[PDB]
Every structure is written in structure tokens, then in C-alpha cells.
């Protein structure tokens, strides 16, 4: 049972140790495509690469490479695409992937600027009247609407394949208040955010996999997917007990390296899952308490 494990780990002060255990057990697979010299400028961080076996391939003859991994959680019947924050030259690739993969949602867990440095290109339009065109991939992107809340912003975007002139609505869920250092004090606002994404349909099997990114697409991105999947599994077999967060994390790590970057991110994942479990186990009232406690308006 995870809350007892949580308190035991807290009591013994052994988060760093548990986390290192995970790093040591984690899968190691080749990333040969990522490391080809022609792809050097498609990678944001030299230490964060997609495994060859799980990487998303762009459907182009030229260079099919993007730093993105399909994380396919069999038991939970949830898939996620984890990717890096787009680079100035990979914004077209990014939206190409969203198109080809049939995604409905993009979950962004970072700010464009953090710690006084650029963590991500401005890959979506900030004003309705100033649409973006990505010439390399022949796609058009238009801001349709935006709903700014205190800890996140949801945008409706229209993505057009300029080749065929089909259009889709993409929802952009932008968690804006992850702190520069550490993790959130309370998971409340994070859970409220996750539930907002869920509510939207973006995580659901009638759509392609949700695209999740932060700067590197492993830390915050890892935390989001881990929490979602754990909560889902707890739902599917109604048994907090059986769901082993460490085991789920290791399973996820078969598909992309580095998921959960710090011991404090691990601890936070536990907190989120534990607190989230309230809703899942029958206490429907709990979601209204997160909305109040997250302080979302203004």
C-alpha cells in the first residue's frame, strides 16, 4: 500500500536511495537514430534521446526523425507521446507529428522562459489574427481561443494540413506554475490540471496519443504520465493496494529514458497519486475541493 510506503520512505529519509534504485534498474536501449550527425540539431539535450524501438517517426521520406517517444501502457490502455520542447527548427516537425499521430491534445508543462533561459520555442500563435505557417511541413496553425486560469491556460488551436485542407481542433493544456526549482508544495493544482486534460477527451482511445512535453520531455512529462496511469490502474481494478508506482515508472522507462528526473519528483508523484486516489475510490466531492484549493480564477 503506497501511503504506508510513502510514510516509511519519508520516516527513513530514503527518497534519494529509492530513486537511485530506479535509475539503476531502468532499461537501456539504443538510440542510434537520435545520435546520427544529421539529427544533432533536432535534439535539444544531448543526454535526452528517444530509444529507437519506441520513437515516433515522421511520415516523410527526407528525415523521419523527431525527439519523441511512444509510451504505450498496455494494462492501463493509455498511450502518451513524450517529446522535448520544440526547437526553432523543429516546430514544423512537432505539428507534423501531432497531425500524423492524430493527437487531440498537447500538454505543455513548462514556460517558454524559465530560470532566465529559453526552454522551448514559441511553437503556437499568441494572437488569433497572427496565424503560423510551417513551410517545411506545410501546416497552418491558428489560435481559436484561450482560457487563462491562475495555474494553467487552455487553448483551442486549429491545425490545417495545407496539402489536403483538412483541419482539426487541437487542445493545448499549458501548466504555467510549475516552480523554477523543486516540485509543487501541494499536488492539488497538478491533479486539477490532469483532470482538466482528462475531461477534454484528449487522453481517450478514440484519439491519437496525447503529446506531452516540458523542456526535455522526461521530468515533469514523466510525472504527469506516471500519475495518470497509476490513477487509471487503480480505477480499473479498484485496488489502491495492487498499484506499484515504482513498477509503473520502470515500465514507462522501457519507452523513454529519464522519466522522473529527481527524487523530489518521485516523492511528488506518490503524493499526487495518493491524493488523486481519493476521487478514484468514491469521494467524488474531492475534485471540487481541488478547484477551490488550486485557486484557479484570476
Curated annotation (Swiss-Prot):
Q: Which residues form the active site?
A: 214 (phosphocysteine intermediate)
Reaction(s) catalysed (UniProt annotation): O-phospho-L-tyrosyl-[protein] + H2O = L-tyrosyl-[protein] + phosphate
Instruction: Indicate how the chain sits in the lipid bilayer.
Output: Peripheral membrane protein
- Sites of the modification Phosphotyrosine? 19, 65
Name one molecular function that GO assigns to this entry.
protein phosphatase 2A binding
Modified positions (Cysteine sulfenic acid (-SOH)) in chain numbering: 214
**Where does the chain bind substrate?**
180, 214-220, 261
Q: Which residues carry this modification: Cysteine persulfide?
A: 214
Query: Which residues are recorded as modified (Phosphoserine)?
Result: 49, 241-242
Q: Which protein family is it in? A: Belongs to the protein-tyrosine phosphatase family. Non-receptor class 1 subfamily.
Q: What does this protein do?
A: Tyrosine-protein phosphatase which acts as a regulator of endoplasmic reticulum unfolded protein response. Mediates dephosphorylation of EIF2AK3/PERK; inactivating the protein kinase activity of EIF2AK3/PERK. May play an important role in CKII- and p60c-src-induced signal transduction cascades. May regulate the EFNA5-EPHA3 signaling pathway which modulates cell reorganization and cell-cell repulsion. May also regulate the hepatocyte growth factor receptor signaling pathway through dephosphorylation of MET.
The identity of this protein, by name, is Tyrosine-protein phosphatase non-receptor type 1
User: What lineage does UniProt assign to this protein's organism?
Assistant: Eukaryota, Metazoa, Chordata, Craniata, Vertebrata
Which part of the entire sequence is included in the shown chain? 2 to 299 of 435
Amino acid at each position: 500500500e503506497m501511503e504506508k510506503e510513502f510514510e516509511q520512505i519519508d520516516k527513513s529519509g530514503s527518497w534519494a536511495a529509492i530513486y537511485q534504485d530506479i535509475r539503476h534498474e531502468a532499461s537501456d536501449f539504443p538510440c542510434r537514430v537520435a545520435k546520427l550527425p544529421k539529427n544533432k540539431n533536432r535534439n535539444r539535450y544531448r543526454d535526452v534521446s528517444p530509444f529507437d524501438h519506441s520513437r515516433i517517426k515522421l511520415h516523410q521520406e527526407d528525415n523521419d526523425y523527431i525527439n519523441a517517444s511512444l509510451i504505450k501502457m498496455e494494462e492501463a490502455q493509455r498511450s502518451y507521446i513524450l517529446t522535448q520542447g520544440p526547437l526553432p527548427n523543429t516546430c514544423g516537425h512537432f505539428w507534423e507529428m501531432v497531425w500524423e499521430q492524430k493527437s487531440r491534445g498537447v500538454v505543455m508543462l513548462n514556460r517558454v522562459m524559465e530560470k532566465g533561459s529559453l526552454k522551448c520555442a514559441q511553437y503556437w500563435p499568441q494572437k488569433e489574427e497572427k496565424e503560423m505557417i510551417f513551410e517545411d511541413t506545410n501546416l497552418k496553425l491558428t489560435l481559436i481561443s484561450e482560457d487563462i486560469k491562475s495555474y494553467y491556460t487552455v487553448r483551442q488551436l486549429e491545425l490545417e494540413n495545407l496539402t489536403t485542407q483538412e483541419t482539426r481542433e487541437i487542445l493545448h493544456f499549458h501548466y504555467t506554475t510549475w516552480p523554477d526549482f523543486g516540485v509543487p508544495e501541494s499536488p492539488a493544482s497538478f491533479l486539477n490540471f490532469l483532470f482538466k486534460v482528462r475531461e477534454s477527451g484528449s487522453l481517450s482511445p478514440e484519439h491519437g496519443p496525447v503529446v506531452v512535453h516540458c523542456s526535455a520531455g522526461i521530468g515533469r512529462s514523466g510525472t504527469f504520465c506516471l500519475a495518470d496511469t497509476c490513477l487509471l490502474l487503480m480505477d480499473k481494478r479498484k485496488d489502491p493496494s495492487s498499484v506499484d508506482i515504482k513498477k509503473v515508472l520502470l515500465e514507462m522507462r522501457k519507452f523513454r529514458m529519464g522519466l522522473i528526473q529527481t527524487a523530489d519528483q518521485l516523492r511528488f508523484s506518490y503524493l499526487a497519486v495518493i491524493e488523486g486516489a481519493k476521487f478514484i475510490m468514491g469521494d467524488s466531492s474531492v475534485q471540487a475541493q481541488w478547484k477551490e484549493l488550486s485557486h484557479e480564477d484570476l
